[PDB]
Amino acid sequence: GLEEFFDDPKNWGEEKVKSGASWTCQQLRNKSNEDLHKLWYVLLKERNMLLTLEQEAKRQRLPMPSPERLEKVVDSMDALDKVVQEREDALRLLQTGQEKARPGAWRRDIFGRIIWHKFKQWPIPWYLNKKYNRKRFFAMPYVERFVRMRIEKQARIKARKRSLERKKEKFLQEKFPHL
Amino acid sequence: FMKYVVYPQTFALNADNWYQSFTKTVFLSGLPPTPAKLEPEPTLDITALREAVCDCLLQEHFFLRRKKRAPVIQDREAIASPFLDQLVASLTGLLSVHNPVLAAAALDCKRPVHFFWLRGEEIIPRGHRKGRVDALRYQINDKPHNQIRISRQLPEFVPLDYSIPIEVPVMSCKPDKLPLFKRQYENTIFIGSKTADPLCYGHTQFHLLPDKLKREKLLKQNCADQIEVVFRANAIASLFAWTGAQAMYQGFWSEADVTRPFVSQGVITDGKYFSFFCYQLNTLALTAQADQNNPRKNICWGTQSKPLYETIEDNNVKGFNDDVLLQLVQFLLNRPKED
Amino acid sequence: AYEWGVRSTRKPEPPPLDRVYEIPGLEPITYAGKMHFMPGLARPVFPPWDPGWTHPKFRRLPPLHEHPLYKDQACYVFHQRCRLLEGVKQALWLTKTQLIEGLPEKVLRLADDPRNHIENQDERVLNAISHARLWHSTEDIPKRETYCPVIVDSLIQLCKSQILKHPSLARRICAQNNTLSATWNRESILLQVHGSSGARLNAKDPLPPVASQEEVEATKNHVLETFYPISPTMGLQECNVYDVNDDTGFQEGYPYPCPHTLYFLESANLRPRRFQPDQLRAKMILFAFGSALAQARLLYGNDSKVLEQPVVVQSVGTDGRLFQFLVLQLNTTDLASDEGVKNLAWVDSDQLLYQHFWCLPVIKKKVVVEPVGPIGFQPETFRKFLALYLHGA
Amino acid sequence: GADRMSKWTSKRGPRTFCKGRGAKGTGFHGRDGKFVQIKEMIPELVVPELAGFKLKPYVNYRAPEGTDTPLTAKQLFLETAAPAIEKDFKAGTFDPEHLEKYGFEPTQEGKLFQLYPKNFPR
Amino acid sequence: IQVHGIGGGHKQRYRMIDFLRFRPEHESKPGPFEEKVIAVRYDPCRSADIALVAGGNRKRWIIATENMKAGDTVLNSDHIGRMAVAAREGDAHPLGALPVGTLINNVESEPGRGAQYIRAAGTCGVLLRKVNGTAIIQLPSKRQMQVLETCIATVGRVSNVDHNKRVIGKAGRNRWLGKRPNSGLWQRKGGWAGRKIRPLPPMKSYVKLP
Amino acid sequence: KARGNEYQPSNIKRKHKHGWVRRLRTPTGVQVILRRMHKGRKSLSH
RNA sequence: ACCAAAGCUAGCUCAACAUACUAAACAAAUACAAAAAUACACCAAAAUAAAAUAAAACAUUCACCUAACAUUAAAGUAUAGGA
RNA sequence: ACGAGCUACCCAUGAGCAGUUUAAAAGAACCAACUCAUCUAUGUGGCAAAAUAGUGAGAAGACUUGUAGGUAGAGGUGAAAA
RNA sequence: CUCGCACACGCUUACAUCAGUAACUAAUAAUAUACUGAUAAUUAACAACCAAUAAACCAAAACAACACUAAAACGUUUAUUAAUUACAUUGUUAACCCAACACAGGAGUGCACCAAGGAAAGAUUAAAAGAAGUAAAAGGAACUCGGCAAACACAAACCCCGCCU
Ligand SMILES: [Mg+2]
Ligand SMILES: [Mg+2]
Ligand SMILES: [Mg+2]
Ligand SMILES: [Mg+2]
Ligand SMILES: [Mg+2]
Ligand SMILES: [Mg+2]
Ligand SMILES: [Mg+2]
Ligand SMILES: [Mg+2]
Ligand SMILES: [Mg+2]
Ligand SMILES: [Mg+2]
Ligand SMILES: [Mg+2]
Ligand SMILES: [Mg+2]
Ligand SMILES: [Mg+2]
Ligand SMILES: [Mg+2]
Ligand SMILES: [Mg+2]
Ligand SMILES: [Mg+2]
Ligand SMILES: [Mg+2]
Ligand SMILES: [Mg+2]
Ligand SMILES: [Mg+2]
Ligand SMILES: [Mg+2]
Ligand SMILES: [Mg+2]
Ligand SMILES: [Mg+2]
Ligand SMILES: [Mg+2]
Ligand SMILES: [Mg+2]
Ligand SMILES: [Mg+2]
Ligand SMILES: [Mg+2]
Ligand SMILES: [Mg+2]
Ligand SMILES: [Mg+2]
Ligand SMILES: [Mg+2]
Ligand SMILES: [Mg+2]
Ligand SMILES: [Mg+2]
Ligand SMILES: [Mg+2]
Ligand SMILES: [Mg+2]
Ligand SMILES: [Mg+2]
Ligand SMILES: [Mg+2]
Ligand SMILES: [Mg+2]
Ligand SMILES: [Mg+2]
Ligand SMILES: [Mg+2]
Missing domain, CATH: 2.40.50.140 (Nucleic acid-binding proteins)
Structure with a gap:
């Protein structure tokens, strides 16, 4: 069963390989979950063959015969992963209602920033964990000057961007007086 | 200089063929041709030998209690190692009355045997020495479970210039693909003793299979013929290394070749299964400059793996193979020629 | 007094509790809700952790009284590495035997007979000495854990070669790392020897009694030597968990029931790791008595009585250069009393098998003053070893 | 003064520094110092039978697409739970206290694959 | 440092x-x-x-x-007696049981505290007198120490008497013992130097009077 | 003798003296990291 | 004749208005030696700003000197100052 | 704020000293590896921001040296040369 | 003519194959381990990662027999519980590192003095001055601050100052 990494031998020496369109999201939504589970491996073997052919075309210094097949396949993979994620997050919104798959908290780190800290799996609680208590989630009083300076810098950047767009609008209006 | 470290106990897939390529030895299935000029020596009592072997089985399987084993997996190394020492000691003691040479022989227990030799040529692919020619060196670091050493040499099975139509398999690949790896340390050629020991010849070797090379582990690894291949590679490595050790404590080397052949016997055991091998070294000139016009070859006769017992339970040995014990007694009954 | 702890190196005491917790009827506000430390909030007090499903590796160790075999009476256990101070005196006291300087006359008659020697005795023993000390290793200077089991196994092979002249040595076998337990009571305290041995020789047939009834009767009025400030307990390990069951390493119906020789190995480089010779003798006395008591209670029963058939167990202790020899005859089970029949023990002490060995040739003033090989040789040690091996036949 | 911009990798450090490349652990260190691999941590790959299954990785060019309607929680409720709830309310057998017959589950920890802890990888 | x-x-x-x-x-x-x-x-x-x-x-x-x-x-x-004890060189006895002219070592300060004073090689203190259930000893620094009579002390002089007469052959032996050499800085002597004749400091007492 | 070779490289010493963990164990090293972030450094530490 | 030279753009600067203020990306790994899923803990802290200068030196003193309270006047006024 | 990856001195953990003379592994002697740098000549934008060649001192100790940690400037360290 | 082979640390593809070099790198060409482009590569047995809790332990390593002082690194068995179940992860190249350089400098360990590594001269001529080496009649320190340097010598004494290493 090692030949599935390659194409059929009639198609090895052909310069152009025609193929169909990529799988559309609305076409993915009509199928059942077992159909998606089988279609994932059906796409997987073809993508492995296309990557093998791409590497061999890179090796033997010849162009890959119609390399848009890999683009269509990875578009199909993105579509199927997307519709499975719609089914899973919709079903989780019905059952629990939590928006995100991983637990997390909005935290204030030592650097002063606001960070979405995702949680991890541990067999022991948080107060007993040696590694976790030496982490610090708070900001010291000296951090506030740097937090303010970060604010001041991004405020200056957006000020110059707004003035730049205003100047470009002025320059185009003065350049072309079609009004 | 750099050398390949050759392991007799190996996990390689086709290791016997690569070892035959490194060794210039041909493997023949079946026993060597029997020297039928024997006197009426088999007045052997089979019942006492069977009772001794069964007593060793019952001791290290049922009777001798260990410290309590909490993994409960019952690792066969600690089970079958003193089984092999007791089997070798008991069979030597019971067969010393028939073979007086075994009384004057010495017994080694877990004492290493080393051999170093050159084979073939190689052009260096990389480095500042690229394009130059440097020979391939090999080192065998082997630790036999038991050894028997004799002051006098065992007799030959076949003559020195005896030719076989089968020819040495040549692999068209680098030795790194086995896998084997180059390592540098001291070059030792060891018999199991130093030179001043008067017993520069031997009788037999005994080799226990480790835990990683078990038949159950191979069947989990999806390995059918590897059971025979591992035993083959172990015999071809160990017996060749030890016969080369005999030849180079006897003063023979690459440009002296070998005057009269070196003959050895080997017993390779998994915890249930026994295998019997014979080796004859004629070639010690494995250097490529001396191997252009060298017609002679080394020979390794092999025996297919056969179990000794079967499903031992509650002081009763259910199955027993008498032919394995007979082959072991015929191996232990070999004597040097007298004059 | 002077306590042996240090305030810095000890684990610190917990920080003193926040003053919110000392207010009755007040709920403290802590950082437990945000599951991380926060300055300005009180430190929460958590209950001790209870893993409802148990894990084997990661749980706390169970206490010693939780074990089913835990008993209130502290038993004193002797294992392989326990040392005794007045080793011969403590061995004689805790074993209740009598010490004899020579080996028995049967052993000397077996040794001194010229028909019992091997073909070229001195040549084979000197070659065995050279093989153990220099030849068997790739290195120029082999270590003691290498050369001591090699010289022991080589001497066993040398005395095993006599089986063609004496076809009664096939009734023996060697055994390794067995579990031995022998528990008894000796003057209101509970003793137990328990552990393993190096290599133990067993046989189908028992060894014949070696001491005469005149010696047994003269042993009766012998008084045991006593020593006041050290208790005879000292050197043993106190244990509160044990089983009162005499356990030899072999189960019922074993074809080789009677041990004939024990072998004791001192395989270590450093001087503090190896036993002193008195400690080595004490170890062989108490282990040989453990094997003999296992024999004399397995064949007779748990009742304590004098033995009409003595039990003889031999042992050899080995340093690699200097040997100790023991023949121990057990006659008495009821060791609670101090007035009854005492057992017997013959000990040859500090038999030097060779004086010194030279692995490399020493050169003084550009000439060789001493050649390679062992200096000094005493074959009487090998003769005693051969008699101890050939004592069955 | 070394390379700060280069990523810190196990190839760079000494023999002491050994860092994984992102793989998942499959066992632990056993009694003898060897590695004991746990079969339970091994990802058992789940494959169907594709011989008797008819589908192809590419779609016909003449096959039309559809108006893109993403899957919504309201649409999933109206398609799955709403006929049962409407039928039970018109039959009078609707129970506000117990909703387990309509597909609702109160606590996730009973079942094998949880959603909010995300027990299943993929 | x-x-x-x-x-x-x-x-x-x-x-x-x-x-x-x-x-x-x-x-x-x-x-x-x-x-x-x-x-x-x-x-x-x-x-x-x-x-x-x-x-x-x-x-x-x-x-x-x-x-x-x-x-x-x-x-x-620990037994104190009114016939005292015959002191050997090994025995440990309380100071109330010892005779008047007894040479002692490893003198305990407080009852139950343990031996602190007179520990160096060859140094021995001497009991002076016992009054009102209180022992007074003389230290190797010739200072009087007042102690409770139930403190245990060992009779005799500490071993290796010739440690004071031990000669150091070289600076290498000092570096073997672990004493680094003194600094090369030349410091002029102040007023602290000189032969100070001071009267003996008074008796140091660890008996707490209520 | 000859100079110019005061830098003898060692990754253990480098990551122990100028590492991220060593920077964050001290408030001064934390302020060093905030100054490098305010300047906009590509590499905050080793 | 080589070397050279010339562009008008990228973009900044100062304000005003203004929401109300640490942007974007977070699928995984990130304070083990950062970007390494996985084990019995410890965690944390504050104490006046000083001096270069001016007083032609320099000791008491020396406006602003990282503490929101703005403008028109009172007013450079009363006061405080090696006065 | 940052610096003891060079150097000054310590705490760990290791590794080297062959031959020769002597009862000696004696801070003894000859002389290698090894460690310093006495003297001279080149070099002086050089091979080199301190080197090369010849010659020298120690070379079983108060000796070199690998890895790692510690002591930080109103200081550290120092067989004091500021 | 002889600083070789490998490992540890450190560097980071600079390694290997093919093709090109008008120009960029070699302080110059020829071409290529040092430039350019494409493609591949280092496969674990070696090394890292790799159990605690109580208890019997005074007795050095120096060929260690047994000793000296400066008192000396380096683990056993006994008991309690240690997931038990093929194949885990990671380093495997090099002519290489620190010195602004393809620098006569610095650089730890294990075995060797070659069985391995390399090339002082781009081609002429053979002026002065300069560096290095060899040899010298007669004299032998008369040169110079000084027997500095050199030499077929490589010895014997007196002081000063610090005992000495
Ligand atoms: Mg840098
Ligand atoms: Mg690394
Ligand atoms: Mg490395
Ligand atoms: Mg494994
Ligand atoms: Mg002392
Ligand atoms: Mg001290
Ligand atoms: Mg002083
Ligand atoms: Mg001074
Ligand atoms: Mg620099
Ligand atoms: Mg001024
Ligand atoms: Mg001024
Ligand atoms: Mg100011
Ligand atoms: Mg005033
Ligand atoms: Mg440091
Ligand atoms: Mg340092
Ligand atoms: Mg020497
Ligand atoms: Mg000296
Ligand atoms: Mg000298
Ligand atoms: Mg210096
Ligand atoms: Mg020089
Ligand atoms: Mg010269
Ligand atoms: Mg010298
Ligand atoms: Mg200072
Ligand atoms: Mg000075
Ligand atoms: Mg000065
Ligand atoms: Mg570089
Ligand atoms: Mg060029
Ligand atoms: Mg390499
Ligand atoms: Mg030239
Ligand atoms: Mg000239
Ligand atoms: Mg000249
Ligand atoms: Mg000359
Ligand atoms: Mg002349
Ligand atoms: Mg003159
Ligand atoms: Mg001179
Ligand atoms: Mg002279
Ligand atoms: Mg002279
Ligand atoms: Mg001097």
Whole structure:
């Protein structure tokens, strides 16, 4: 069963390989979950063959015969992963209602920033964990000057961007007086 | 200089063929041709030998209690190692009355045997020495479970210039693909003793299979013929290394070749299964400059793996193979020629 | 007094509790809700952790009284590495035997007979000495854990070669790392020897009694030597968990029931790791008595009585250069009393098998003053070893 | 003064520094110092039978697409739970206290694959 | 660096030295006991020579007296008596039971505290008088010490008497002991230098008067 | 003798003296990291 | 004749208005030696700003000197100052 | 704020010293590896921001040296040369 | 003519194959381990990662027999519980590192003095001055601050100052 990494031998020496369109999201939504589970491996073997052919075309210094097949396949993979994620997050919104798959908290780190800290799996609680208590989630009083300076810098950047767009609008209006 | 470290106990897939390529030895299935000029020596009592072997089985399987084993997996190394020492000691003691040479022989227990030799040529692919020619060196670091050493040499099975139509398999690949790896340390050629020991010849070797090379582990690894291949590679490595050790404590080397052949016997055991091998070294000139016009070859006769017992339970040995014990007694009954 | 702890190196005491917790009827506000430390909030007090499903590796160790075999009476256990101070005196006291300087006359008659020697005795023993000390290793200077089991196994092979002249040595076998337990009571305290041995020789047939009834009767009025400030307990390990069951390493119906020789190995480089010779003798006395008591209670029963058939167990202790020899005859089970029949023990002490060995040739003033090989040789040690091996036949 | 911009990798450090490349652990260190691999941590790959299954990785060019309607929680409720709830309310057998017959589950920890802890990888 | 001129010495193991002379094994029998001396060895940590003392089920390393040899018998007691005791060189007795002219070592400060003073090699204090249930001794620095009479002390002089007459052959021996050389800075002597004749400081007393 | 070679490289010493963990164990090293972030450094530490 | 030269753009600067203020990306790994899923803990902290200068030196003193309270006047006024 | 990856001194953990003379592994002697740098000549934008060649001193100790940690400037460290 | 082979640390593809070099790198060409482009590569047995809790332990390593002082690194068995179940992860190249350089400098360990590594001269001529080496009649320190340097010598004494290493 090692030949599935390659194409059929009639198609090895052909310069152009025609193929169909990529799988559309609305076409993915009509199928059942077992159909998606089988279609994932059906796409997987073809993508492995296309990557093998791409590497061999890179090796033997010849162009890959119609390399848009890999683009269509990875578009199909993105579509199927997307519709499975719609089914899973919709079903989780019905059952629990939590928006995100991983637990997390909005935290204030030592650097002063606001960070979405995702949680991890541990067999022991948080107060007993040696590694976790030496982490610090708070900001010291000296951090506030740097937090303010970060604010001041991004405020200056957006000020110059707004003035730049205003100047470009002025320059185009003065350049072309079609009004 | 750099050398390949050759392991007799190996996990390689086709290791016997690569070892035959490194060794210039041909493997023949079946026993060597029997020297039928024997006197009426088999007045052997089979019942006492069977009772001794069964007593060793019952001791290290049922009777001798260990410290309590909490993994409960019952690792066969600690089970079958003193089984092999007791089997070798008991069979030597019971067969010393028939073979007086075994009384004057010495017994080694877990004492290493080393051999170093050159084979073939190689052009260096990389480095500042690229394009130059440097020979391939090999080192065998082997630790036999038991050894028997004799002051006098065992007799030959076949003559020195005896030719076989089968020819040495040549692999068209680098030795790194086995896998084997180059390592540098001291070059030792060891018999199991130093030179001043008067017993520069031997009788037999005994080799226990480790835990990683078990038949159950191979069947989990999806390995059918590897059971025979591992035993083959172990015999071809160990017996060749030890016969080369005999030849180079006897003063023979690459440009002296070998005057009269070196003959050895080997017993390779998994915890249930026994295998019997014979080796004859004629070639010690494995250097490529001396191997252009060298017609002679080394020979390794092999025996297919056969179990000794079967499903031992509650002081009763259910199955027993008498032919394995007979082959072991015929191996232990070999004597040097007298004059 | 002077306590042996240090305030810095000890684990610190917990920080003193926040003053919110000392207010009755007040709920403290802590950082437990945000599951991380926060300055300005009180430190929460958590209950001790209870893993409802148990894990084997990661749980706390169970206490010693939780074990089913835990008993209130502290038993004193002797294992392989326990040392005794007045080793011969403590061995004689805790074993209740009598010490004899020579080996028995049967052993000397077996040794001194010229028909019992091997073909070229001195040549084979000197070659065995050279093989153990220099030849068997790739290195120029082999270590003691290498050369001591090699010289022991080589001497066993040398005395095993006599089986063609004496076809009664096939009734023996060697055994390794067995579990031995022998528990008894000796003057209101509970003793137990328990552990393993190096290599133990067993046989189908028992060894014949070696001491005469005149010696047994003269042993009766012998008084045991006593020593006041050290208790005879000292050197043993106190244990509160044990089983009162005499356990030899072999189960019922074993074809080789009677041990004939024990072998004791001192395989270590450093001087503090190896036993002193008195400690080595004490170890062989108490282990040989453990094997003999296992024999004399397995064949007779748990009742304590004098033995009409003595039990003889031999042992050899080995340093690699200097040997100790023991023949121990057990006659008495009821060791609670101090007035009854005492057992017997013959000990040859500090038999030097060779004086010194030279692995490399020493050169003084550009000439060789001493050649390679062992200096000094005493074959009487090998003769005693051969008699101890050939004592069955 | 070394390379700060280069990523810190196990190839760079000494023999002491050994860092994984992102793989998942499959066992632990056993009694003898060897590695004991746990079969339970091994990802058992789940494959169907594709011989008797008819589908192809590419779609016909003449096959039309559809108006893109993403899957919504309201649409999933109206398609799955709403006929049962409407039928039970018109039959009078609707129970506000117990909703387990309509597909609702109160606590996730009973079942094998949880959603909010995300027990299943993929 | 807080103490100068220390470092670069030989590797030394530390011996656990038991300072409390009267230490019963169990509290069931608090009576006086008698132990046996096995060996006397050199200790690299102190100037004295130590001795291994075994009794019951335990051994202790103690500070050896002048003529303590291998295989000796040493009595430890707390019993005070009005006929006193006949003091040998090994025995440990309270200061109330000793005769007036007794030479002592390893003097305990507070009852139950343990031996702190007179520990160096060859140094011995002398009991002076016993008044009102209180012992007064004279230290090797010729200072009087007032102590409760129930404090245990060991009779005799500490071993290795010729430690004061031990000669150091070279600076290499100082570096072996671990004493780094002094600094090369030339410091002019102040007013602190000179031969100061001072009267003897008064008796240091650890008996707490209520 | 000859100079110019005061830098003898060692990754253990480098990551122990100028590492991220060593920077964050001290408030001064934390302020060093905030100054490098305010300047906009590509590499905050080793 | 080589070397050279010339562009008008990228973009900044100062304000005003203004929401109300640490942007974007977070699928995984990130304070083990950062970007390494996985084990019995410890965690944390504050104490006046000083001086270069001016007083032609320099000791008491020396406006602003990282503490929101703005403008027109009172007013450079009363006061405080090696006055 | 940052610096003891060079150097000054310590705490750990290791590794080297062949031959020769002597009862000696004696801070003895000859002389290698090894460690310093006495003297001279080149070099002086050089091979080199301190080197090369010849010659020298120690070479079983107060000796070199690998890895790692510690002591930080109103200081550290120093067999004091500021 | 002889600083070789490998490992540890450190560097980071600079390694290997093919093709090109008008120009960029070699302080110059020829071409290529040092430039350019494409493609591949280092496969674990070696090394890292790799159990605690109580207890019997005074007795050096120096060929260690047994000793000296400066008192000396380096683990056993006994009991309690240690998931038990093929194949885990990671380093495997090099002519290489620190010195601004393809620098006569610095650089730890194990075995060797070659069985391995390399090339002082781009081609002429053979002026002065300069560096290095060899040899010299007669004299032998008369040169110079000084027997500095050199030499077929490589010795014997007196002081000063510090005992000495
Ligand atoms: Mg840099
Ligand atoms: Mg690394
Ligand atoms: Mg490396
Ligand atoms: Mg494994
Ligand atoms: Mg000290
Ligand atoms: Mg001392
Ligand atoms: Mg001084
Ligand atoms: Mg001075
Ligand atoms: Mg620099
Ligand atoms: Mg001024
Ligand atoms: Mg001024
Ligand atoms: Mg100011
Ligand atoms: Mg005033
Ligand atoms: Mg440091
Ligand atoms: Mg340092
Ligand atoms: Mg020497
Ligand atoms: Mg010297
Ligand atoms: Mg000298
Ligand atoms: Mg210097
Ligand atoms: Mg020089
Ligand atoms: Mg010259
Ligand atoms: Mg010299
Ligand atoms: Mg200072
Ligand atoms: Mg000065
Ligand atoms: Mg000065
Ligand atoms: Mg570089
Ligand atoms: Mg060029
Ligand atoms: Mg390599
Ligand atoms: Mg030229
Ligand atoms: Mg000239
Ligand atoms: Mg000249
Ligand atoms: Mg000349
Ligand atoms: Mg002349
Ligand atoms: Mg003159
Ligand atoms: Mg000169
Ligand atoms: Mg001269
Ligand atoms: Mg002269
Ligand atoms: Mg001087």
